[PDB]
């Protein structure tokens, strides 16, 4: 069991002090992927029935916002997303 | 692995990179002996009545009333931020085990009752020309099970030699209890 | 080493060390509350909180505590502090509880005063073994005469009401309750008194209040308890009422003395017990229900208990109620408590619609103990009785053909229609065990077979007057020698015969 | 080996050991509590800590207690001293007469007999009932099983067999209660010291001579934790397979509400981390009962007949517990509240019961040729409920209306007053041997009693009271 | 207090809060947003976090946004000035004739009564209809079945019980309706105005005079959230309670489905992630139920 | 290493073993050298033909009205006590006559009798069976 914010490529920034967080409200970085679902880390901001953009055109809705993650329903398939990939605002 | 395994390996990676490794390495030694004998930063640590306000001003109070790197520094806020600090001590165990790792090991062993400083320095030099580690600290124990002859444990974990009497003897008799 | 430092930054460090005897709250929810502390503290036990409200002890976990809280779930806080009681869950026994309706807790709520203290008995409690224990021997007198003569309640028993919603189980209850008085009133020993316990579970408020005034107004008080843990109260309360009044009693039990608890709602308790489990994410079963329900009402129920004469040779009874669904008695808690208790009484929805009432059948109602919890003077009666009702139960197929029917058959179901009629009784009027012999005596001799259906009443009421005007001393001595000699046999027959000619009658 | 408890749930501890774990099954003491409460591993979970099940109450434990390994599991002591006593799961009488002063102790858990060593000969019983007598032969040196609901006669039925068997059985004898009434419980213990099965004498000095006695005793009750109750069974099974092992004698095993020792397993499950099955029963379901079921087996040095009483949770025959139980009997008798509530006692239902001593080289061809017959007869009757309840028994032809008749009349006929329920009957017993069974049975399949009427064999017996009663009923 | 949200799952709001948390059952206010948002807690969960069921819809919601704890849970306003409004749960009229101008509030979670404050006499209500008084005698204190629908004469039913209560008993009355259509809720509004059981008289400025009535209304419509369906009745009975209390009347309690009740119920529980029971139902079913009707 | 496996071959005629090939009849090992794959591939479309020869399963309903081929797969539902095992251990018995009249392999029937869930009683009973009719000789369970 370990949190988005926990995996080792952040934690690395952190025990190096990297303050890095000026990283908007709009931009996240997609975390897991799979059956029309996403999660994403950031958006602290979003608005619950949001939409979102990825990086390859396609959208979807903000519906389970949570404490680490947030999650997002596709309006296509999966093949255009894949981790690592960025989400912003509309 | 571990959620101490990922701390553990974030800490390695980033003190072998950036600031050092001795001064963390004496941190994480003297963190784990504080733990160990206070008898009341532990239970700081375990309970929730304590705010996180007060938890970070504590750390920062300990960091500039001791040798504190910024790292470690770093390590307890997000282990407060993300509510792992009684994870403390099992960090510090697997720091120690995979790890503390390139200076020098820490071993545990174990004997009857109290050895000799020839056989105690005839056991250290060997288990040196074992390990070709050129820094052991180690550890003395007393266990009677085994009954005299010397157990320990190297810690890595996948190495523990049993040199002992007790075991050699009942893994003998329930080999030699096979079937002709 | 550096305590210093901690009681420098967070004052107040130095308090907060000793979590043998005080803990923390962390979480809330669902009448559960964990805590961080408490090390010490047994399993089982008692917890107060800030507020006074209480708890008890359930799991401990390595770090963690779960506790029950005795309450709703509004006077208890993250953050709250909690001390040790240093006792198990215990209620309050003895003299000082009767005529006192009190919460699961020993708390009272009809405003009179505080409770005397024992030393508090323990609640979850063990039962007796099986070489204290004795056979049923003598009879518990309810003043129901179908019950008293068909379905004999014993001394030492544990005998179900099970029936559909609204067919007089609170009334039969009530009855067994009120017709101590006169046995109580009449004896001054502890020996042959019988005290009583009413456990109401899940019972409308209402409802309770209407039954202690109708107590208090037949002075039905002095002798029972009562304990209340109603459907606005919480989960944990009803879960508990049951165990506190077997509690209560079994200081009657032991003490010599003897008594009767009547749980007047278990299916409330398993209800209760499901929500609390579910509630604690335990697995689901049948129904819902988990496994340790027939654990939960056997606790309770095995300490109904006589024992025997090394022992004191105290008794406990019970009484425990049951509601059905369309009288489905193949469902799981019927079943479970069936394969609990040594007996069973039935109630119909059809013939408390039709008129009779109490509406006990008795072909499904049966009894373990039976005779010995009997006297003699009834036996001889009863058994009859009991006879001739399996007759007429039998030949009632055919009963719209008995002018085609031979004179026996039409015989037996005049007898049978006769004593049914019989057995009907009204609400909080119960009846001697010498007026029952006489009753059902005048019954089997087919004085009443000529005599029409409906007279029957007023026949018995005339009957019951005559006897308790003139022949009293035929009622001393049936109850003094328990037992039909010929002579009192033929005082009642020339009683009856005096009877039936001062009255007039439709036949 | 010292231990420490470290958590407690309900009727479940969790241990902790530093230098030496023991293993699976091994018994630990606990000792800062008033009683003698004892703990059997069942899992381990790592960081040197163990699971285990208490045989008695929690309440009082402390986080940190000690606990004592005793490096073996349970203990039951044998011999012929445990004959004519009672004795809990861990061997302590609570019969209130002295110690168990046996020499040697078994342990409560031992693996089953091996396939060579197993014999499979055909006996045969005398029950004195004319239902299982006939129609579900019971098998000396097999299992047998009772199932039924609540309230159909499995307590009288099981008291009735030993009243029919153990007392004109000359060997020796046990009895399991696994939760079943201490009332019961405590008749069953003054029943036998009445009829002479428990022969107890108190000598001068305040001890005790049970020499003479037939029938040891288990009970683990309904007031007892579930460690309590899924342990009984297996203490009894060693008590009997000592007697079956050394001694070499044929035992009988006389066990009420096995079903029990399932539902301890699921009021337990939830409390070890198990994750449920269908109606909430374990996965462990089959084996935990194949385990003990193995152990009760005829072999070449001695033999247990059994007698279980298997509970129906809400008259379910489908239920996990006795579907799985239904594999490992050789006879079976299935009690039914249909024909309990038309006052027919036992109220066996003779289709549902079956059994593997029925065939022709077993039992003789009449034997079987009968019991087939009444099997085909009570079928064809049940073919017409369903007609009968819509439109009549007027539809119906000349043959079937004969048909309904023999059935009813054979019916009638399957029942039996016994002794024991004379307390709640009045009537006496009647025992029925076999050939007098058979001889009516074979008269009403022929048709040498049409003339009789129907309430002429309702607790009867053989057919010579059934004539007198009907003669009586003429007039 | 002041807390912050820290996730939204539909009808589920969990807040954090620096100190002294709210108790279970207090209501909260959100800031930053129109349509003013209300949620009631109802589970503590540690870290200083609470879970709470929204009143309304949750969209348009933030991560951080702010929440106020009103340190008290719903508060009902009560007295003769709500004869003849509507109320939705939190007690704001929808009626749009102004607001309840009352002097007092009261809470929508109150304590039964308690053994003592209890009548043992019963007695029967005259009601003044003919079938009812014989067959089906009412009685006070009691709590009446109504099985049927409509084309039968139902809520003429009840305007005649209304009607004759207040004109016999004096005692005012009460109508709830839990998870009702809009459209008959509307036809119910207009059939009282019609028959006189609401006198809303206009004034000179505009305003509106509710002279004396014989029922206030309390609706939760069946486009609301689960969570308000299940607090409704608790609002019309605590209405209630203030007549039968203070005033000392013999009112009445009309409930439009009690069934509606029991599926929010089920619902709350199922969003809050209680194990149902056998055929659905929340596990709280019983104990819910008693906590409503023992008043 | 080994993937689990157990032995082949007419070493196992006449014999009884577990699930893992170690005998439990009492009398001697199990003399076979060559093993094979529990969990393998089944064989596919081509190295296959159709169901021409029949099985003698020695009863008249099936044998007449539910014929049984050389390579089928049937199923024999029921409930419990119906005779189901009557069944199979009729179709073992009626091939030793088959088998004694001839010394062709491509001919005889070899029968295996895999018993889950049974009781040691039951599975000794059966072999019992077997025993009394010489049906064993071309068996193994």
């Not at chain 1, 055109?57 to 255009?80: C, H, K, P, Q, Y």
């Not at chain 3, 390595?62 to 709703?72: A, K, M, Q, R």
């Not at chain 3, 799981?332 to 059948?361: C, H, M, W």
Request: proline share 4%.
């Amino acid at each position: 069991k370990i949190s988005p914010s926990e995996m080792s490529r952040l934690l690395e920034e952190r025990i190096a002090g990297w303050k890095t967080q000026t990283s908007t409200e709009e931009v996240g970085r997609v975390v897991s992927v799979g059956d029309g679902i996403a999660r994403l880390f950031g958006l602290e901001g979003v608005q619950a029935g949001e939409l979102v953009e990825f990086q390859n055109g396609m959208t979807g809705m903000a519906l389970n916002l949570e404490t680490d993650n947030v999650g997002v329903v596709i309006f296509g398939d999966d093949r255009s997303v894949l981790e690592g990939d960025s989400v912003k605002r509309t | 692995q571990t959620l101490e395994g990922r701390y553990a390996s974030a800490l390695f990676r980033v003190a072998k990179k950036k600031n050092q490794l001795e001064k963390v390495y004496g941190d994480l030694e003297s963190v784990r002996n504080a733990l160990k004998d206070s008898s009341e930063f532990r239970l700081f640590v375990d309970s929730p009545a304590v705010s996180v306000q007060q938890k970070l001003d504590v750390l920062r109070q300990l960091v500039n009333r001791y040798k504190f790197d910024p790292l470690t520094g770093n390590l307890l806020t997000t282990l407060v931020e993300n509510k792992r600090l009684p994870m403390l001590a099992r960090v510090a165990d697997a720091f120690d085990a995979m790890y503390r790792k390139e200076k020098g090991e820490v071993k545990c062993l174990v004997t009857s009752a109290k050895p000799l400083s020839a056989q105690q320095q005839k056991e250290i030099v060997a288990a040196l020309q074992n390990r070709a580690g050129t820094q052991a600290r180690l550890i003395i124990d007393y266990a009677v099970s085994p009954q005299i002859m010397g157990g320990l444990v190297v810690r890595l974990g996948e190495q523990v030699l049993d040199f002992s009497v007790a075991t050699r003897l009942d893994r003998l008799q329930s080999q030699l209890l096979a079937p002709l | 080493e550096m305590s210093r430092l901690l009681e420098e930054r967070i004052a107040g460090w130095k308090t907060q060390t000793s979590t043998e005897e005080v803990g923390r709250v962390v979480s809330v929810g669902d009448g559960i509350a964990r805590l961080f502390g408490l090390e010490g503290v047994q399993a089982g036990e008692l917890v107060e909180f800030q507020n006074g409200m209480t708890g008890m002890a359930l799991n401990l976990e390595t770090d963690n505590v779960g506790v029950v809280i005795f309450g709703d779930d509004r006077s208890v806080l993250e953050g709250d502090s909690v001390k040790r009681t240093g006792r198990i869950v215990d209620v309050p026994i003895g003299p000082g509880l009767l005529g006192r309706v009190v919460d699961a807790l020993g708390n009272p709520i009809d405003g009179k005063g505080p409770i005397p203290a024992k030393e508090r008995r323990r609640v979850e409690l063990k039962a007796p073994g099986i070489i204290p224990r004795k056979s049923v021997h003598e009879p518990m007198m309810t003043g129901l005469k179908c019950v008293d003569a068909l379905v004999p309640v014993g001394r030492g028993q544990r005998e179900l009401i099970i029936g559909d919603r609204q067919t007089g189980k609170t009334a039969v209850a009530v009855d067994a309750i009120i017709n101590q008085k006169e046995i109580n009133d009449s004896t001054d020993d502890e020996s042959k008194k019988l005290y009583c316990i009413y456990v109401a579970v899940g019972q409308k408020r209402s409802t309770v209040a209407q039954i202690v005034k109708a107590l208090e107004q037949r002075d039905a008080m002095k002798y029972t308890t009562v304990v209340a843990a109603t459907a606005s109260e919480a989960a944990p309360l009803q879960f508990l009422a049951p165990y506190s009044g077997c509690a209560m009693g079994e200081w009657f039990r032991d003490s010599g003395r003897h008594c009767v608890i009547i749980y007047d709602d278990l299916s409330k308790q398993a209800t209760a017990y499901r929500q609390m489990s579910l509630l604690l994410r335990r697995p689901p079963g049948r129904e819902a229900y988990p496994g340790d329900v027939f654990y939960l009402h056997s606790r309770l129920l095995e300490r109904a208990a006589k024992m025997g004469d090394k022992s004191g040779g105290g008794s406990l009874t019970a009484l425990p109620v049951i509601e059905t669904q369309a009288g489905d008695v193949s469902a799981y808690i019927p079943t479970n408590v069936i394969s609990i208790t040594d007996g069973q009484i039935f109630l119909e929805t059809e013939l408390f619609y039709k008129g009779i009432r109490p509406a006990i059948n008795v072909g499904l109602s049966v009894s373990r103990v039976g005779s010995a919890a009997q006297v003699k003077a009834m036996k001889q009666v009863a058994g009859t009785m009991k006879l001739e009702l399996a007759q007429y139960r039998e030949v009632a197929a055919f009963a719209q053909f008995g002018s085609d029917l031979d004179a026996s058959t039409r015989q037996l179901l005049t007898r049978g229609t006769a004593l049914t009629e019989l057995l009907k009784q009204r609400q909080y009027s119960p009846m001697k065990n010498s007026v029952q012999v006489c009753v059902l005596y005048c019954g089997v001799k087919g004085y009443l077979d000529p005599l029409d259906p409906k007279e029957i009443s007023r026949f018995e009421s005339l009957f019951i007057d005559y006897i308790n005007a003139n022949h009293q001393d035929i009622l001393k001595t049936i109850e003094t020698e328990k037992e039909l000699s010929e002579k009192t046999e033929a005082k009642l027959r020339a009683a009856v015969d005096e009877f039936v000619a001062m009255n007039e009658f439709k036949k | 080996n010292h231990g420490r408890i470290t958590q407690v749930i309900g009727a479940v501890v969790d241990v902790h050991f530093d230098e030496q774990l023991p293993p699976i099954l091994n018994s630990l003491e606990v000792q800062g509590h008033t009683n003698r409460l004892v703990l059997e591993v069942a899992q381990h979970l790592g960081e040197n800590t163990v699971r285990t099940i208490a045989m008695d109450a929690t309440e009082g434990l402390v986080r940190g207690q000690k606990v004592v390994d005793t490096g073996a599991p349970i203990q039951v002591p044998v011999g012929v001293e445990t004959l004519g006593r009672i004795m809990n799961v861990i061997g302590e009488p609570v019969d209130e007469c002295g110690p168990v002063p046996a020499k040697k102790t078994y342990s409560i858990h031992r693996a089953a007999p091996l396939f060579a060593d197993q014999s499979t000969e055909p006996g045969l019983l005398q029950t004195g009932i004319k239902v299982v007598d006939l129609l579900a032969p019971y098998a000396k040196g097999g299992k047998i099983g009772l199932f039924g609901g609540a309230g159909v006669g499995k307590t009288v039925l099981i008291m009735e067999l030993i009243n029919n068997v153990a007392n004109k059985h000359g060997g020796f004898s046990v009895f399991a209660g696994v939760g079943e009434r201490t009332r019961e419980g405590n008749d069953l213990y003054h029943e036998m010291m009445t009829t002479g099965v428990i022969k107890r004498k108190k000598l001068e000095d305040g001890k005790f001579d049970f020499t003479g006695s037939k029938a040891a005793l288990v009970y683990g009750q309904m007031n007892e934790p579930p460690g309590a109750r899924a342990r009984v069974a297996l203490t009894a099974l060693s008590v009997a397979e000592y007697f079956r092992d050394e001694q070499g004698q044929d035992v009988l095993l006389f066990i009420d509400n096995i079903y029990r020792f399932t539902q301890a397993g699921s009021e337990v499950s939830a409390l070890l981390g198990r994750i449920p099955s269908a109606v909430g029963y374990q996965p462990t379901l089959a084996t935990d009962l194949g385990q003990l079921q193995e152990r009760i087996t005829t072999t070449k040095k001695g033999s247990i007949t059994s007698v279980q009483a298997v509970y129906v949770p809400a008259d379910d025959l489908t239920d996990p517990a006795p579907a799985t139980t239904f594999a490992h009997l050789d006879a079976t008798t299935v009690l039914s509240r249909q024909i309990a509530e038309l006052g027919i006692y036992p109220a066996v239902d003779p289709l549902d019961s079956t059994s593997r001593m029925l065939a022709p080289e077993i039992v003789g061809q009449e034997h079987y040729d009968t019991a087939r017959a009444t099997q085909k007869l009570l079928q064809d009757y049940k073919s017409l409920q369903d007609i009968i309840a819509i439109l009549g028994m007027d539809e119906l032809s000349e043959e079937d209306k004969l048909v309904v008749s023999r059935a009813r009349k054979i019916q009638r006929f399957l029942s039996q007053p016994f002794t024991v329920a004379e307390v709640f009957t009045g009537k006496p017993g009647r025992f029925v041997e076999l050939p007098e069974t058979i001889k009516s049975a074979q008269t009403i399949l022929r048709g040498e009693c049409d003339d009789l009427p129907e309430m002429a064999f309702y607790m009867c017996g053989g057919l010579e009271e059934v004539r007198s009663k009907a003669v009586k009923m003429a007039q």
